[PDB]
C-alpha cells in the first residue's frame with residue numbers, strides 16, 4: 663500500500679543523483695509513502711541524531727553536502743508523523759529499506775534520456791510500476807548501470 667521511492671546515481675542529473683555517482687552510491691532512499699499527506703504540526707520534531715540512524719540515506723539538499731537531514735526531516739514531516747505516530751517505527755522501517763537498497767523489484771519513476779548512449783537513465787525508482795516521466799519510448803533503461811529492457815526489472 664505504501665509507495666517506496668528512491669534516487670539512483672546519474673552524473674547527468676544535477677543534485678543528489680550526481681552526488682551519489684561521485685560517491686559510489688547506487689541507491690539512496692527518497693521516502694515511504696502512505697496515502698495520507700501530513701499537514702500541520704508534527705507530533706514530534708525529528709532530531710538530526712534520530713534521522714542520521716537512516717544509515718545510507720543521502721539528503722537531497724546541497725545545503726548539507728547531500729548528507730543529512732533536510733530530506734530525512736522533510737519525509738518525517740510530510741509523510742511520517744501522521745501515519746506512523748512515533749518516530750521509532752518509522753526510523754526502523756526507513757533504515758531497513760535503505761539497507762536493502764544498499765545491499766542490492768525496481769520500476770523506473772523518472773528518467774533522463776541520454777542521447778550519447780541511447781539510454782533511459784533512471785534517476786528515481788520504486789517498488790511498484792508507475793506512469794513514466796522523461797523516459798523515451800522503446801529505449802532501454804539504465805538502473806545505476808544495470809541495463810534492463812523494460813521499465814521494471816520484474
Ligand SMILES: *[C@@H]1O[C@H](CO)[C@@H](O[C@@H]2O[C@H](CO)[C@@H](O[C@@H]3O[C@H](CO)[C@@H](O)[C@H](O[C@@H]4O[C@H](CO[C@@H]5O[C@H](CO)[C@@H](O)[C@H](O)[C@@H]5O)[C@@H](O)[C@H](O)[C@@H]4O)[C@@H]3O)[C@H](O)[C@H]2NC(C)=O)[C@H](O)[C@H]1NC(C)=O
Nearest residue numbers: 663664694695696697698745746747748749750751752755
Ligand atoms: C504503511 O504505512 C502505514 C502508515 O500509513 C504503516 O502503519 C502504521 O504502522 C505503525 C508501526 O510501524 C503503527 O504505529 C504504532 O501505532 C500504535 C498506535 O496505533 C502505537 O502504540 C505504536 O507505538 C509503540 O508504542 C510505544 C508507546 O506505547 C506503549 O509503550 C510500550 C513501550 O514499553 C509499548 O510496548 C506499547 O505499544 C504501549 O502501548 C511507542 O512510543 C513506540 O514508538 C512503539 O513502537 C506505533 O506508533 C501505526 O499505527 C500504523 N498506522 C496506520 C495508519 O496503519 C504501515 O506499517 C506501513 N506498512 C508498510 C509495509 O510499509
Ligand SMILES: *[C@@H]1O[C@H](CO)[C@@H](O[C@@H]2O[C@H](CO)[C@@H](O)[C@H](O)[C@H]2NC(C)=O)[C@H](O)[C@H]1NC(C)=O
Nearest residue numbers: 666754755756757758759760761762763765789
Ligand atoms: C528487506 O529484504 C528482506 C529480504 O529480501 C525482506 O524479507 C522478506 O520479505 C518477504 C516479503 O515481505 C517475506 O515473505 C520473506 O519471509 C522475507 N525474507 C527474509 C529472508 O527476510 C524484507 O521484506 C525487506 N524489507 C524491506 C523493508 O524492504
Ligand SMILES: *[C@@H]1O[C@H](CO)[C@@H](O[C@@H]2O[C@H](CO)[C@@H](O)[C@H](O)[C@H]2NC(C)=O)[C@H](O)[C@H]1NC(C)=O
Nearest residue numbers: 715716717718753754755757758760761762764
Ligand atoms: C540501521 O541499519 C543498519 C544497516 O544499514 C544496521 O547496522 C548495524 O549497526 C549496528 C551497530 O550500530 C550493528 O548491528 C551492526 O554493526 C550493523 N550491521 C550492518 C549489517 O551494518 C543498524 O542496526 C540499523 N539501526 C537501526 C536503528 O535500525
Ligand SMILES: *[C@@H]1O[C@H](CO)[C@@H](O)[C@H](O)[C@H]1NC(C)=O
Nearest residue numbers: 672673674675676680683684
Ligand atoms: C560528470 O559531469 C561533469 C559535468 O557535466 C563532467 O565534467 C565530467 O566529465 C563527468 N564525469 C563522468 C565520469 O561522466
Ligand SMILES: *[C@@H]1O[C@H](CO)[C@@H](O)[C@H](O)[C@H]1NC(C)=O
Nearest residue numbers: 681684685724726727728729
Ligand atoms: C562534500 O562531500 C565530499 C565527499 O564526502 C567531499 O569531497 C567534499 O569536500 C564535501 N565538502 C564540501 C564542502 O564540498
